[PDB]
């Protein structure tokens, strides 16, 4: 009758990318959506869940605090195995390279349930880092029946592995589309109103620090929004449009990233991007750079003093990251992924194009 | 210099007949520390073999299967193979095969950052869920590796074609036949073979009725030819061996045969009739031609090699087929003269100079296995 689909949470940054998923799971009659969340503590996903309005239908306690990898491991294949013994979903989504995201690809494969890995295939080469990143995201691939890859990169990388094309889909970032339900306008924030309509610079080794202040200082229409470097950070900043507020949470983020003028950062270099905000990296290695979504910074305070001015000034440079189309999302990811699902186990004829 | 502390980790019986000929090579370099680790949750089942070899292992981890589900075992084996890597940090780690203790032993490593030498590495089938779950154990633990040994150039193939760097593979032939070194006995004894004497002497190893009858047939038209037979008594069998073997006081059925045990009676045997894949990569290495039981050969090498024969289920061809190896010498010769394409016994030689090199206690590189 209906295809019996399961997505599996657990840390909050997959709570977002996965929400637009569980999502369009809904608009299809044939599908029939669980959502099980495999997370310690609740109390991090309600937010996103709600945003969403997300009601789990499963909910494992895995404990992953003062634990070791095999530990938490094994809880978390324990408890999953358990779950799978009684629901017993057709296909098993699971999303990155958490090690809970190894953890029930490999509890669903004991039980023959078959597994689709969304934001599939990305490779450091390296198998130490990040660790145990890669390799969860190695092993889950090995288990994985079908590959929703971000990115073309990412399906070479699958390719590589000698895995069947046939298999592998470019369905570009599911982030993007969580922006189209996390992004509001009538956003209230009182940190937001001391900017009023001032050009504001969403911030995240003291040169930088050194570097915007004097930003700060020299453009008077301009304000910093920012959340050892608690304390080096707030010497540096006594200043009245350099707000040193608390860390923001993703959907504060995002909304932070919406009403920014441009953004500097040391992850966001994916959301924002679609939302036309420049992003000016810190760092020499980047592992949008040649999209024209993200520009390179460095450590120097004439660098970044440099670049941070050319887009304060330069109307055209600054035009250039504000119109960049995003490489990673056109924000219907989820979307070709169900309709993916739909084509993969004969419910629709037709194909999805993949994301280009 | 600073020696290397290496670990061998193994808990089944056709495990430790593949790992204790490399744990005997690792004992004859001072270059290396090596410890053995059994995971056997009942340590009687490898007793046979460990004194076979004279292995006294440092560790002995019993872990628990028996009416198990994969997720516990999986989870039992880490959670045992963690608390030991914990508390002995050895170098490299080295683990064999397929069995889900292989991998969960790989990925305990892997989260201490201890390096693994995956033995038998490479062996594929398409197959997600065949065998379920070996096949996709040698995949995890091939994902964890860092050095490859593979039994042969296809393994070595199969490796490079899922992008695993050509620099970390070594084509080593089977340990298996490395076995073969140390398990037959010159002075090996046992009741049958009393009452088969001087008698060429055919193995058998498994339409079984059609099997019978071309036995019956041989044993008849050859008076100086026994058969052995290990089987686990059964009722279809032990109806089926008093039709056709009846009364024929030269074929002999007997107790299912132990590794060391089936060594020993396949370097006395004439010739072997099996459809085991065993029996088929390390009989040749003793030089006893070998009659496959089967129309579709699971190793093809071995065909080419002119050391295994298909001989299919019907009766008749089995006959023949039989009959030749006996009467022909030239084809005899032929057979039992092959190059068997699995190994040469210097396996587990070639591993070990493999992880001398890598360490840089060697500047040199062993021979790759041609065979």
Redesign the interface.
Do not use: G, R
């Given at each position: 009758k209906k295809l019996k689909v399961m997505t599996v949470f657990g840390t909050r940054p997959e709570a977002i990318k996965m929400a637009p998923l569980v999502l369009e799971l809904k608009k299809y009659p044939e599908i029939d959506s669980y959502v099980t969340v495999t997370a310690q503590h609740r109390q991090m996903l309600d937010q996103v869940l709600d945003a969403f309005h997300i009601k789990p239908d499963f909910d494992l306690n895995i404990m992953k605090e003062r634990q070791?990898?095999?530990?938490i491991?094994?809880n978390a294949?324990?408890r999953?195995?358990?779950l799978f013994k009684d629901i017993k979903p057709d296909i098993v989504l699971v999303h990155g390279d958490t090690t809970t995201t190894f953890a029930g690809s490999?509890?669903a494969?004991?039980h023959?349930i078959a597994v689709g890995h969304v934001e599939a295939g990305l490779r450091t080469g390296n198998?130490?880092s990040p660790?145990?990143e890669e390799?969860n995201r190695?092993?889950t691939g090995?288990?994985a029946?079908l590959h929703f890859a971000p990115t073309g990169q990412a399906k070479d990388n699958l390719l590589?592995?000698?895995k069947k094309a046939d298999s592998i889909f470019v369905t570009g970032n599911t982030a993007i589309d969580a922006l189209n339900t996390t992004v509001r306008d009538g956003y209230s924030h009182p940190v937001l109103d001391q900017v009023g309509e001032d050009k504001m610079i969403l911030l995240t080794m003291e040169n930088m620090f050194k570097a915007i202040r004097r930003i700060v200082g020299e453009f008077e229409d301009v304000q910093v929004v920012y959340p050892p470097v608690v304390r080096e950070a707030a010497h540096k900043h006594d200043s009245d449009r350099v707000h040193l507020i608390e860390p923001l949470e993703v959907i504060d983020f995002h909304n932070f990233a919406a009403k920014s003028h441009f953004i500097l950062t040391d992850g966001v270099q994916e959301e924002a991007p679609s939302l036309g905000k420049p992003v000016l990296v810190l760092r020499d290695t980047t592992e949008g750079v040649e999209a024209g979504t993200l520009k390179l910074a460095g450590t120097d305070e004439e660098n970044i003093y440099q670049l941070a001015k050319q887009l304060l000034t330069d109307p055209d440079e600054y035009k250039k990251m504000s119109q960049a189309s995003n490489p990673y999302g056109d924000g219907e990811a989820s979307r070709r992924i169900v309709e993916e699902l739909l084509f993969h186990y004969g419910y629709r004829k037709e194909q999805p194009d993949s994301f280009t």
């Open positions: 070791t990898l095999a530990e491991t094994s294949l324990v999953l195995d358990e490999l509890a494969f004991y023959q198998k130490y660790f145990p390799l190695q092993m090995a288990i029946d590589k592995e000698n």
